[PDB]
A paper describes a structure:
The molecular chaperone DnaK is essential for viability of Mycobacterium tuberculosis (Mtb). DnaK hydrolyzes ATP to fold substrates, and the resulting ADP is exchanged for ATP by the nucleotide exchange factor GrpE. DnaK is assisted by DnaJ (Hsp40 in eukaryotes, a J-domain containing cochaperone) and GrpE, a nucleotide exchange factor (NEF). DnaK is composed of two main domains, the N-terminal nucleotide-binding domain (NBD) and the C-terminal polypeptide substrate-binding domain (SBD), and these domains are connected via a highly conserved but flexible linker.
Here we report a cryo-EM analysis of GrpE bound to an intact Mtb DnaK, revealing an asymmetric 1:2 DnaK−GrpE complex. We went on to derive a cryo-EM map of the DnaK−GrpE complex at an average resolution of 3.7 Å. The structure of the intact complex reveals that one molecule of DnaK binds asymmetrically to a GrpE dimer, with DnaK NBD and SBD straddling across the GrpE dimer. The Mtb DnaK adopts a disjoined conformation in which the NBD and SBD are separated with no direct interactions, and the α-lid is in a closed state. Therefore, the DnaK–GrpE complex is likely in a post-reaction state in which both ADP and substrate have been released and the SBD lid becomes partially flexible. There are three significant contact regions between DnaK and the GrpE dimer. The major contact (contact region I) is between the proximal β-sheet domain of the GrpE A and the DnaK NBD subdomains IB and IIB. The other two interfaces are between the long N-terminal α-helix of the GrpE A and the DnaK NBD subdomains IA and IIA (contact region II) and between the long N-terminal α-helix of the GrpE B and DnaK SBD (contact region III). We observed in the consensus structure that the Mtb GrpE β-sheet domain wedges between the DnaK NBD subdomains IB and IIB, thereby widening the nucleotide-binding pocket to facilitate the nucleotide exchange. Therefore, rather than being locked in a static open DnaK NBD conformation for nucleotide exchange, the Mtb DnaK−GrpE complex undergoes a series of defined motions that are centered around and coupled with the ratcheting of the GrpE dimer.
Numbering used by the authors:
A (entry chain D): 3 to 159, 162 to 184, 186 to 261, 265 to 513
B (entry chain E): 44 to 155, 160 to 187
C (entry chain F): 45 to 134
Write the structure that this text describes.
Amino acid sequence: RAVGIDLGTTNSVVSVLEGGDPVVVANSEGSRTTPSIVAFARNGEVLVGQPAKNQAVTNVDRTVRSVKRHMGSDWSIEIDGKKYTAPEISARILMKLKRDAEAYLGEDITDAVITTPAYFNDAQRQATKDAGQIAGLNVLRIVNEPTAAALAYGLDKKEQRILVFDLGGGTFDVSLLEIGGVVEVRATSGDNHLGGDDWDQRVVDWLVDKFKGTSGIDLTKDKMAMQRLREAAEKAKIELSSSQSTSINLPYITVDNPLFLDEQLTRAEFQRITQDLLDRTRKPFQSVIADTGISVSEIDHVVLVGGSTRMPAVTDLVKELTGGKEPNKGVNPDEVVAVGAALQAGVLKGEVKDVLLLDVTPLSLGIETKGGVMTRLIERNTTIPTKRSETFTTADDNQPSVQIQVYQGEREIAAHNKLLGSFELTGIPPAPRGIPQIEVTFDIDANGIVHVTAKDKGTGKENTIRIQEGSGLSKEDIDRMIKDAEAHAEEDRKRREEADVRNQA
Amino acid sequence: AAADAAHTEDKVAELTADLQRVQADFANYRKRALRDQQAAADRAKASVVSQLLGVLDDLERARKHGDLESGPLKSVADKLDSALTGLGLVAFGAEGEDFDPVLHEAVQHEGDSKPVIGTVMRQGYQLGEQVLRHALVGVV
Amino acid sequence: AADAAHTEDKVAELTADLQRVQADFANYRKRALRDQQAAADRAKASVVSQLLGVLDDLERARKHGDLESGPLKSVADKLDSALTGLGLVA
């Protein structure tokens, strides 16, 4: 029910709550980020996203591109209308996201948290809330992007000190927040005309200048060539957060002999042409440091927010503004804000905490089967209070008793896994293998206490074990099992035993 | 006591109000085993064509400029498009048709009244019923 | 008449019911999500079967040295570069 919406000046991501977790709902055409170019049609049929943007490159004056750049101020136009109200333009993409939340299985997404930049105002919050309520979506939290990102990464406590570096893509925002018993923010300030689109335009301009050097073609009126160059530059920029040696080659720009544009754009040149944009960050960070009592080491954690923060220059600047501290990872920077909004929406209306999700993962749970192999019953991260079933059978003809051992350790080889206990069931009448069915269940409660019981479906013989050793393991050693299991990823020897089971039947 | 009984009643009511909600959500997600099961995977089908669309357009403008109207590479392009046709390649934005915003990525507006494509600078491409990339069309 | 024991038993039972149901929900939300990615193998399909023949044709053309020109040398390299990520070699 809860929805996490990150409205933006350039992009917009929506994420609904699937129980206790947020998931970023893909839009109509597969993507997640809906390009927030809320452009009206030739006649009436309002479009949002790429269906609206494609009608904007041709029709410049039939389109509102960015609305988050204006709050309260009437950045309004009219299209067969009469002074259409401003925030309703973003209410249109909000309505699109509410409709598109049904792309994942939903019924009525009527609760959502909308996010706003750190640079805030009573007018800005009121405008976003009015747009939300016009869009038909009840909203109670309008959390700032910094704190929303911090919640997304997980900060709900000592006296935390979270730093935020919102590269944005079109707008910039940096702030330091001290997370204590309440959500706390001190003072925010940053660039408003600066974003990754400036890096894109800078590489576009570099390519244009290089082609003007290599040939006399103006490359300022060949609109098809302009789209080719812009797409190539954006692709190169996104790819530049890898393979520091980069090049692009657009096949057909313009001919009379087909001219072959080709440049080996290097990230060295990227910095050489974007250093002014990068150094525009220094003033906001020094300003937010000096506004209150802050030291370079006073920052506890920093989070990278905003699209296209993967640029090495920005990460270097962040780690040279505080020290060799690494930021938080796990959630994609273009969608951290929506994840945070969804988590906050869940928290507000009572969907997290309680006794739910306090259980996280009982590491490993399984029973060893014949042949040095273990049959998994409860998956590695499966929430602790589970229930399972399995119909096993005696491995030998006329077997009087069957012994089943419970083991933990995701490794397929139970010899290296830790022994927990053994329970043997007797009273089995002598019968050939295949017909008997032995039911095995893993019963586990909130505290982590395990129950493994085996019952004979054929007759009724039942034996029980109470190993209870799943809990109490040291948390430091738990992370070592992750590496132990992941190192031996290519472990398919169990298929040999599975084939060897061919003797039966 | 009375206060303890009231607190216990409140806890019972809260747990009851949560149990049916989580059960209903679990059923709703169980419904997804056949609804979006192929959609998320077929996003990979969309990707394995979204990557090749650039090469397809490059070949298209190679044929348009006559540098590759014939030749072995023209045959290579023919084989590629013929093979991909089985997957559902239905090129849109054909010359002389109506301008569809949901299907066409119009860039240049040479003439400011039914909108129509002046020229397909880049032919739009499709994979079954999934609109992949809007056709680059010069609306006139 | 107080039924305090009955209410405590109901508390101890409904809590376990909530826990079991949420665990089933999470287990199946991981299960079906695992099929969401197991079906990527089916999504692979014969796309490579249709790309590898094209790659082989352009490579056989390249063996004669034709792919040494100017603008003619762009398409094959672009196709190979895009294919290598989402396709196997000849």
